[PDB]
């Protein structure tokens, strides 16, 4: 579906952003 | 410090994007 | 419903981001 | 200016999330 | 129309994340 | 260092989010 493809892409963006956020936390703490 | 705050904000933003994706899926399912 | 529940969560994230924004302004100012 | 720039960006994201929440309620209400 | 408002809000979030990326680069290269 | 990598990744996330928003706008338009 059209909106399902948009949502899938958004979910991948969000998972990538969560990883970046964790990496930045660890750099910050260190 | 500031970078740890920024990391938390990126995590909040990722959470919002994931929820927006689920909202789009529910809209499609309607 | 499902979309209204997401809307509430997004409003809470928005408040969290505004709190972090003020924390960053405080760090910059001080 | 870096931290203040990020704070301003987070505030704009917060506004955008409130806009999305409002749109979701409008969709939900039909 | 509400879905278009959601898309416009996502565009604003993307611009704001670009500004956050730019600010973090400035901190990194400082 | 790491923060430069994080900023570049965030810029890539923002570019992708812009494309997602544009696709959603076109869906919303018909």
Residue numbers in the entry:
A (entry chain D), B (entry chain F), C (entry chain C), D (entry chain B), E (entry chain E), F (entry chain A): 1 to 30
Q: What does the study report here?
A:
Here we describe efficient routes starting from validated parallel and antiparallel peptide assemblies to design two families of α-helical barrel proteins with central channels that bind small molecules. Computational designs are seeded by the sequences and structures of defined de novo oligomeric barrel-forming peptides, and adjacent helices are connected by loop building. For targets with antiparallel helices, short loops are sufficient. However, targets with parallel helices require longer connectors; namely, an outer layer of helix–turn–helix–turn–helix motifs that are packed onto the barrels.
Our designs focused on the g-a-d-e sites of the classical coiled-coil heptad sequence repeat gabcdef, as these sites contribute most to the helix–helix interfaces. Specifically, we investigated 20 sequence combinations in which g = Ala, Gly, Leu, Met or Ser, and a and d = Ile or Leu. We solved high-resolution X-ray crystal structures of three peptides using ab initio phasing. One structure, with g-a-d-e = Ala-Leu-Ile-Ala, revealed an antiparallel hexamer consistent with its solution-phase oligomer state. However, this was a collapsed bundle, conflicting with the solution-phase binding data that suggest that this peptide can access an open α-helical barrel. Also, we have reported a parallel α-helical barrel that accesses both an open barrel and a collapsed bundle in the crystal state but still binds DPH with low micromolar affinities. Thus, it is possible that Ala-Leu-Ile-Ala and Gly-Leu-Ile-Ala can also access an open conformation in solution.
